[PDB]
Design a protein around this ligand. Structure first.
Ligand SMILES: N=C(N)c1ccc(CNC(=O)[C@@H]2CCCN2C(=O)CNC2CCCCCC2)cc1
Ligand SMILES: [Ca+2]
Length: 223
């Protein structure tokens, strides 16, 4: 997150870190057995880390649980990042508490202009690199689809939306991949892609979660 702030420990209790020896992606807890992340975060050997604030210090509220199964969206296209969404099953159910909580799925999509919270452990610099160890937060509005498509001609699909600031300085970034965009109490996006980070007229592009709720619900019910 570039241009954001320190959230504070466990103030985003649905935020997960995916670990394969190291943090490599975010995710969102949607019930005690399942996480949703980006398809481009797929890899073998994932451990889900819940209850995290400093990802390099054991502070006392963590739960580390191996994934038993990954399900990348059937229609994910890695070349275009269309349908950039993936479900991860936990080997054992998380113990849900005030620091380890699920986020609700949308009943409908969010409107342009709605303010959202984006969070993660990704790079905080727009030029160069610095990775935080505690969780960072950013308030950002959803942008109109027209502004989104003008920024990225021919590359935006119905399964994507932009959020952020066209003037630059505030955005998600590498390492935030797979993490949540929460608006009005619902998971509406997943950190997916963009051009650089926090560059002018290149806002963040997010997987449009409201298009996948039926797939998510049916998939979790059958797995
Ligand atoms: N909001 C931002 N500025 C932001 C930028 C980048 C990321 C991390 N994501 C990535 O780097 C992803 C995953 C692997 C390939 N990624 C890419 O973004 C590669 N570019 C795609 C492919 C080209 C056609 C349109 C799609 C964009 C996360 C956030
Ligand atoms: Ca920790």
């Amino acid at each position: 997150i570039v241009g954001g702030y320190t959230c504070g420990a466990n103030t985003v209790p649905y935020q997960v870190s995916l670990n394969s020896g190291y943090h490599f992606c975010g995710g969102s807890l949607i019930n005690s057995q399942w996480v949703v992340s980006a398809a481009h975060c797929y890899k073998s050997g994932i451990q889900v880390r819940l209850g995290e604030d400093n990802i390099n210090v054991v502070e006392g509220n963590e739960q580390f649980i191996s994934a038993s199964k990954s399900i990348v969206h059937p229609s994910y296209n890695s070349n275009t990042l269309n349908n950039d969404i993936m479900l991860i099953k936990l080997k054992s159910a998380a113990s849900l508490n005030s620091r380890v909580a699920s986020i609700s799925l949308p009943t409908s999509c969010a409107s342009a202009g709605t303010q959202c919270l984006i969070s993660g452990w990704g790079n905080t610099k727009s030029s160069g690199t610095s990775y935080p160890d505690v969780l960072k937060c950013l308030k950002a509005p959803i942008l109109s689809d027209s502004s989104c498509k003008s920024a990225y001609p021919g590359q935006i699909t119905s399964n994507m939306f932009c959020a952020g600031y066209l003037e630059g300085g505030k955005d998600s970034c590498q390492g935030d991949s797979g993490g949540p965009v929460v608006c009005s109490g619902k998971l509406q996006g997943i950190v997916s892609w963009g051009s650089g980070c926090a560059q002018k007229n290149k806002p963040g592009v997010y997987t449009k979660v409201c298009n996948y709720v039926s797939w998510i619900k049916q998939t979790i019910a059958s797995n």
